[PDB]
């Protein structure tokens, strides 16, 4: 039965050095990002203005086809660079810098992994991106910058060819994940440690990746609660650090001996964005 300190020792001794990381909305809410599942008062109001019946409808095609304004209200909030990474992002950046990151799989669409300096080659934005968009009527693609002015002006962007609503390439319920998701085929059998941070593990097929690592591989969960496949089918080398995600990350940094390198990385990257 492994402890958090055991996992930090495996890393310090380089017994684990090919780390795969899975993250969700829990690592972005410390940055101020509105979690769509738990909206803040201001965002909740603006969404209610257009009769959003429930949070998940923001990412449902039938609702979007009927009324795209709630989605574009949320999209306006997630303009690239309107937010700053937090300690969890910089920890993952430090994992990369120390040569330990095999791949980071994210469900978030805020782009904060990229802002924190984790390279795109190391990232799988499994639920899509605002970098591109697709007409919902004729399926023509566009660069994401082609719709940005409209989105920032509270206008629904429309196709120059057919006038249909153009939708950013965020993966909605029922849509295919991007092909880059298929990096999991080789990545997960290659991982020697799996980290899960700030996700409810309730969206598929992302959640089932937790079962893709070999059974020798410790699965370390840093999360408020034990959730998903980690709860339903535990493995003997699972470790759960249950509580606030930022505090969990900071405890792991302390056990690793990375506290000063973190402090230096934060000041350096805070200097970049200020």
């Amino acid at each position: 039965k492994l402890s958090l300190q055991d996992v930090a020792e495996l890393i310090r001794a380089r017994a684990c050095q090919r780390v795969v990381v899975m993250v969700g909305a829990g690592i972005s809410t410390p940055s101020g990002i509105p979690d769509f599942r738990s909206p803040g008062s201001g965002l909740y109001s603006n969404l209610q203005q257009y009769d959003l019946p429930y949070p998940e409808a923001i990412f449902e095609l039938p609702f979007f086809f009927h009324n795209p304004k709630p989605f574009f209200t949320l999209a306006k909030e997630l303009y690239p660079g309107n937010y700053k990474p937090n300690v969890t992002h910089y920890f993952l950046r430090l994992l990369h810098d120390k040569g330990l990151l095999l791949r980071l799989y994210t469900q978030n669409i805020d782009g904060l992994e990229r802002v924190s300096g984790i390279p795109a080659s190391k990232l799988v934005e499994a639920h899509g991106t605002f970098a591109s968009a697709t007409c919902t009527v004729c399926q023509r693609p566009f660069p994401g910058e082609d719709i940005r002015a409209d989105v920032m002006a509270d206008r629904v962007p429309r196709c120059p060819v057919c006038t249909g609503v153009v939708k950013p390439d965020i993966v909605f319920f029922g849509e295919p994940l991007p092909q880059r998701f298929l990096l999991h085929v080789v990545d997960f059998p290659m991982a020697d440690l799996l980290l899960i941070l700030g996700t409810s593990l309730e969206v598929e097929p992302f959640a089932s990746l937790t079962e893709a690592v070999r059974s020798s591989v410790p699965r370390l969960l840093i999360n408020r609660d034990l959730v998903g496949p980690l709860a339903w089918h535990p493995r003997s080398r699972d470790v759960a650090q249950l509580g606030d995600v930022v505090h969990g990350v900071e405890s792991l940094v302390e056990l690793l001996g990375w506290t000063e390198e973190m402090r230096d990385l934060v000041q350096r990257e805070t200097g970049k964005l200020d």
Binding site: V171, L177, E204, P205, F206
Partner: peptide
């Protein structure tokens, strides 16, 4: 592989 939830 299509995105889903609840099952």
């Amino acid at each position: 592989a299509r995105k889903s939830t609840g099952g």
